[PDB]
Amino acid sequence: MEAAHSKSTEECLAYFGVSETTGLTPDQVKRHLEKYGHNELPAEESLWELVIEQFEDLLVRILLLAACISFVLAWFETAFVEPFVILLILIANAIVGVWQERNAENAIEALKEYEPEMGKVYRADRKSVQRIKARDIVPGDIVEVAVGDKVPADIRILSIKSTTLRVDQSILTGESVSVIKHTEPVPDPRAVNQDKKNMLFSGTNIAAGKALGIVATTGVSTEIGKIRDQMAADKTPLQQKLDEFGEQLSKVISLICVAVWLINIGHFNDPIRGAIYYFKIAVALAVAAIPEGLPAVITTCLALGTRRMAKKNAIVRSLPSVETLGCTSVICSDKTGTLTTNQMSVCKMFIIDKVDGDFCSLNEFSITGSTYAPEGEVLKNDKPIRSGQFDGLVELATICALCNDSSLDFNETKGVYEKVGEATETALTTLVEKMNVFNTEVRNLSKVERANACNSVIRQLMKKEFTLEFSRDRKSMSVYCSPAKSSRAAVGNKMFVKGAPEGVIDRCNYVRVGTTRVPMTGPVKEKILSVIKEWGTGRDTLRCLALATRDTPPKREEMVLDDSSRFMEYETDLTFVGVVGMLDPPRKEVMGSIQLCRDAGIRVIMITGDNKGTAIAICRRIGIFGENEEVADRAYTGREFDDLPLAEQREACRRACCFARVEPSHKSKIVEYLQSYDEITAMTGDGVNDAPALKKAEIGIAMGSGTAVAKTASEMVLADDNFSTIVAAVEEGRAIYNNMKQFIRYLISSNVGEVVCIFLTAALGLPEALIPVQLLWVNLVTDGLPATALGFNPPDLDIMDRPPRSPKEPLISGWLFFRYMAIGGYVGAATVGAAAWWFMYAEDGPGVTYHQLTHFMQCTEDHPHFEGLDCEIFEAPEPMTMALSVLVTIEMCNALNSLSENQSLMRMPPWVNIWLLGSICLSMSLHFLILYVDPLPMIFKLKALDLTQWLMVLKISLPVIGLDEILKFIARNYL
């Protein structure tokens, strides 16, 4: 429906033929789904297409053309199939590397299924609201949006349920001041988005309120969907350092390749002309040794890592945050959903007992049962007691039942009593059901009926006229009640107040004692406050609520209800009744999680609604502070924080581990101050108010069970809201890194080997140790089997014992670049030494133990001077198989050196990555085929002796393991 902003609500409902109270029928949904498509951008559409990509490379085709010119010169005159073989190998090297890249990219794309765009509809098939994938929303259905929600489609507003609807449309209009909405038509059909004040645009936010509307356009037809068509679409620090190093390596190898075409100056004449031989050998090294385009295994362990993370409940939204994740040095976490289970239970409570001048005594009680079940006893001095015998408890229960927007619900399949409203409130419902202050019959009730039986007995003694909702300035709420149907002696209207102890107790002029009343004094106040403190500070670190009644409340038309700031005044002149103490245990895995952070050099900062005293005590229980540690400079309330000068506030964030009772703007500030010390901070949040901080944080972390706005501003979502999930995500972050570095080390050294190998032959003047098709053969087996197996190796051993990596750190340290050269140098020398060994000290027709092989160039005509042997044993097919076999086996060996960055094979055995071992055996069974299955050794070279020759291949290759061990020792025992 194109111009819905200009028509009446009644015209929009008319247009689609939809009831506003009902919503679309399954039949309508079905027909609309066909007519209008899904609420999404069209999927953009491969196996063969991606193979040709590699053949676009200039240096790849330079090889092919050189093997074509070499083939044509043969046909008009091994060398015959050379162009056919290379082509087959290079399609295979392409297939292997292009197939990994696409699967990694698909798996990473498939992360979006963990947190799919959701919408809320009323449809004809249910009375209740239905949460569905935004994708399945259709033009014409009835949509409900409220605070924190992302608008799922372009919607004409039907009715605003809250007093006011506030919308953040910045993403579409640039204005970042939330905007007011209405319901009347906006007559101008040409009107700009800014003027469509009755409209809700897909991709935007509800910054406050609640509204119902009808969907006008979806998918592409939507305002943001038109923009996303015309829209046309930044490298991470580790991507820059890898690209830059990619060019440093690329140009050195390119110079050395041309240096191979030069030093073989005169040799263009032996059996302008022979340069096609030394050119086609130089270009092959370029194709094998230079890594052009991102190696696929890299993107594979990122893909394997975030898949692992998602299974551990950390949903990565921003991939660049996987890089930041192992640099995090600070975690700021909210307490309730995250450090604690949020399973509330009242385990303690008290009322006033006796008051005599300075003297005040209390009736304390404890309550068993910690789930939401109405099952447990009320104890005093450890003895079971009946709450109704205490008139003050009758009143305390009346307050808990009336100051409450929650109920219990028995879930018949799960067999469990579940919560309806807020955990805190439901804990009070549960309590009330256990106290059963009026001795109502409950024993014969079904579990369904039992859930709220006692709460309703209370709820029938009065009418709940209205509620003074909670607000942050007073930290208390209240309800206003009149007696129902009229009792015997018409007692006046009442108010019941619950809230934070400190604030409500100050507003009390009286205290209840039984059913009698007595003036609030200093002595009574001190006694009330001391027990609040003991329970706040004791083993169970309880959250205390104070409960009061205003005995003589104002008249009704004295009280304005749309103005939250007059609410405190109405809640004065109170009568203190009693206190309840709530349990909310720390999660089981949290102490261990915090100790891991200590070990990894990560500071943890708790933010809580608890009072300061309690906040500290929780921190001692969970290991954030030591049970004796001084804390006076490391713990702050938002109030104390606001009273500090700016420089002092800053210094407080340098060292603080505990913030209690913070204004909504504090998180942002903490982020800023932490950044002023180059901290890499992770910050949790869930509300529309947490969004600015989540934006500023290096890693914003949103709660799975929280708002979409917080999720949209974050890098990561916690599926289970759990603090431990965060720590485990740092664990993976660091692991992925070490996995990249293990693959990078193996890739660089093996390619450097290829270079040193060939350069040594051309430099000294030796006969070619490896023919180009052999080089392209090894280059394919390694990159195909063992190299991709390292993408599947386990986490490195002590990644949570090193401190966090700096963002300014270089990708490859000098020491590491040494480990690249030293290892690459030994392989290059070992391959050329294995061919030269056959010539020097080997029993199969040798050269000279002095040095004669250098001048192999002069033989066929230069026989009588300094030879005395045949001159075709330099084209022999055995020295080139010794060089090949040493390369292949030292490549399998070099892979065992890539199981861990710094751990010895004595600690991390070869069988740690069991897939690596497999791919080796697969690599060997392929090698035992180009030496034995009889058409192939002809196209390459001929086999090595059954025993004695292999023992040299092994005694040459195996010290590569021994060498890297020393270099690992000079890294383990160096630190």
């Binding site: 199939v81 056919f84 073989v85 087959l88 190998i89 399609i91 295979a92 297939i95 292997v96 197939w99 990994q100 394997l304 898949r307 692992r308 299974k311 394919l780 087996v781 195909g784 089997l785 991709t788 197996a789 993408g791 599947f792 897939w915 497999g918 791919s919 697969l922 392929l926 085929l929 180009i930 299955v933 058409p935 192939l936 196209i939």
Partner: peptide, 29 residues
């Protein structure tokens, strides 16, 4: 067996790709 089981799938595809390559060099001749 769940995530480790995609290593066998990954290598087998690469093995087949390399093996097919050799058998084509066999046939040509």
């Amino acid at each position: 067996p769940q995530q480790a089981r995609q290593a066998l799938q990954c290598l087998f595809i690469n093995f087949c790709a390399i093996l097919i390559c050799l058998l084509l060099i066999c046939i040509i001749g």
